Amino acid sequence: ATRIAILGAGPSGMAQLRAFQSAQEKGAEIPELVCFEKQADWGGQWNYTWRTGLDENGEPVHSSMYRYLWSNGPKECLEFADYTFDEHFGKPIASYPPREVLWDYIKGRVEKAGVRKYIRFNTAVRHVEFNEDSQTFTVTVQDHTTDTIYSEEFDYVVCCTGHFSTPYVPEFEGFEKFGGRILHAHDFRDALEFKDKTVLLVGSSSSAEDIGSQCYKYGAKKLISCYRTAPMGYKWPENWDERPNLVRVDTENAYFADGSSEKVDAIILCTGYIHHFPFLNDDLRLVTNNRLWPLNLYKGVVWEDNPKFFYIGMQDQWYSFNMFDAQAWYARDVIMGRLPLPSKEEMKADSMAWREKELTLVTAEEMYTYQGDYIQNLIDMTDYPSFDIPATNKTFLEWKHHKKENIMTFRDHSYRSLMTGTMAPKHHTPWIDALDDSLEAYLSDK
C-alpha cells in the first residue's frame, strides 16, 4: 504494498512520517511513504523566507512568519511528548524562544527519526483525484527541479498543507487612493521597514498583537489598533492607540466609527486566513471557517465522505505540535487497520456531538480545555505517549493572565516543563531589548 501520499512537510506532515517510522521502529510493517513539499526545505510556517506573494517557482509563498518572531506562547505548551527541551539542548532555556531556536528543536526530532528520505522537496501538488473503480487516489504534482508534471497512484492521502497561508483580505472604502502600503499579516516580514512610521493594524487575531508588538520594539512612531470583534483591553504603551473599526481611508488618512481620523503610513490587515485547497475537487475538499471543530472530520482527521482521505491540523490551534502528533498517530493506526472505523452515520453523530459542545464554548479557559479534551481522546486510542494536558491548560491560563497584566513583558516570564518539571530560567536579555533574532545570541551569555 500500500502507498500513502503525504501533502506538505510542515510540523503536521513531519508528525505523520514520524508516526509511521516510530511504528516501524517497534517492529511493524509499514506502507510505502511519499511526502510532497513545495519548498526546498521542511518546516512549513517555520521555514522563514524573505519572499512574499509568490515564490521562485511561482507558487504562493507559504510562510507567514516574520523576522524577530518569538514563541507565541510558552515553549512548555508545545513541548513534544517523545522529545524534550532538556533532551535537545542539554541546558534549561527561557520560556519563549525565537523562531530559529524552535525550528532547530523541531528539526532535531525529525532528523533523529530519519524521515527526510521519504520527502520529495520542491514538488508542488496540483491535483488529488479519487477513482471509484480503482478505489485509489491519483496525485498529480509539479516537480520544479526538472519542471515536469507527473502523477502517481496511492491508496491513502494525508493532507497537511495548513490553513494559515491563504489570506482573507477584505477591502475597505478608498483603498484604491491610499498612498501608503497595504499588506496582510501574511505579507509582513520586517518591523524595520516601519521604523519611524505610523501603522494601522486592522483585525483582532493573535498576530495583530504580535506584529504590532514587533513594530513597537523596532522603532515605529505610532501603532493604532481597530476591530469590530470584542476589544481585548490590554496595557498598551504610550504611542499605541486603540480605536473602533475602520470605515474609510483616503490618500493618507484613516477614518473610524467614532468619527475620528488620523494620518497613517501603512495599513496591516490582520484579518485571518481561509481554508484553501486548489488541488482538490468538492468530493475531497474541506470547506470551513477557522474554529476548534470543523465538520465532516471524524475524530477531527477522517474525511467522512471518503474515509481513505485524512486531514491533519485543520482545527484552530490553541495547542499545536502535540495535537498534530496525536492526529498523525491516530490516522496512522486507521490506515494500518489497528483502529476500525464506524459507519458513516455513526461518524457523523460523533462529529455532531463535538460540534454541539464547541458551540457552548465562551471563555478562553473552556476553549483550550475542549482542545485538551480532544487531544486526550486521540491519545487514549494509540501507543502515543500521554502527557499532562490539564497542567498544560493551566500554563496556558497563566500565560493569558500575564498578557492581561502587561502585553509587553509576558515573554520575559517563565514556566515549568510538564515533561520534566524543570523550571525554565529567566532569559539573559529582556524581550524589549533583545533585538538580535538569532539562535547563537539566544544560546549564550551576552
Ligand X SMILES: Cc1cc2nc3c(=O)[nH]c(=O)nc-3n(C[C@H](O)[C@H](O)[C@H](O)COP(=O)(O)OP(=O)(O)OC[C@H]3O[C@@H](n4cnc5c(N)ncnc54)[C@H](O)[C@@H]3O)c2cc1C
Ligand Y SMILES: c1ccc2[nH]ccc2c1
Residue 143 binds which of ligand Y, ligand X, its own copies, none (CB < 5-8 A, kind-dependent): none
- The Cα 432–Cα 412 span in angstroms is 9
- Judged by CB under 8 A, does residue 131 bind its own copies? no
Instruction: For residue 387, give the H/E element and its range.
Output: none
For the chain, helix, strand, coil in percent to 5 are 30, 20, 50
In terms of Cα–Cα distance, which of 202, 214, 183, 166 is closest to 63?
Answer: 166
Instruction: Enter the C-alpha cell of residue 252.
Output: 493618507
- The Cα 26–Cα 155 span in angstroms is 23
The CB-side HSE value for 319 (13 A sphere, CA atoms) comes to 32
- The Cα 243–Cα 264 span in angstroms is 13
Stretch that binds ligand Y, among 5-13, 128-136, 205-213, 379-387 (CB under 6 A): 205-213
- Judged by CB under 6 A, does residue 205 bind ligand Y? yes
Ranges within 308-327 binding ligand X (CB under 6 A): 313, 317, 320-321
Residue 205 binds which of ligand X, ligand Y, its own copies, none (CB < 5-8 A, kind-dependent): ligand Y
- Judged by CB under 6 A, does residue 288 bind ligand Y? no
- The Cα 98–Cα 48 span in angstroms is 12
- Judged by CB under 6 A, does residue 137 bind ligand X? no
Nearest distance from C-beta of residue 368 to its own copies, angstroms:
28
29, 132, 196, 282: residue in contact with its own copies (rule CB under 8 A): 282
- The Cα 8–Cα 45 span in angstroms is 11
Nearest distance from C-beta of residue 428 to its own copies, angstroms:
23
- Judged by CB under 8 A, does residue 148 bind its own copies? yes
- The Cα 327–Cα 441 span in angstroms is 35
Nearest distance from C-beta of residue 10 to ligand X, angstroms:
2
Stretch that binds ligand X, among 69-77, 262-270, 369-377, 426-434 (CB under 6 A): 69-77
Q: Which residues bind its own copies (CB under 8 A)?
A: 48, 50-56, 58, 60-61, 126-127, 140, 142, 147-150, 166-167, 169-171, 175-176, 178-184, 186-187, 190, 192-193, 274, 276, 278, 281-282, 285, 287
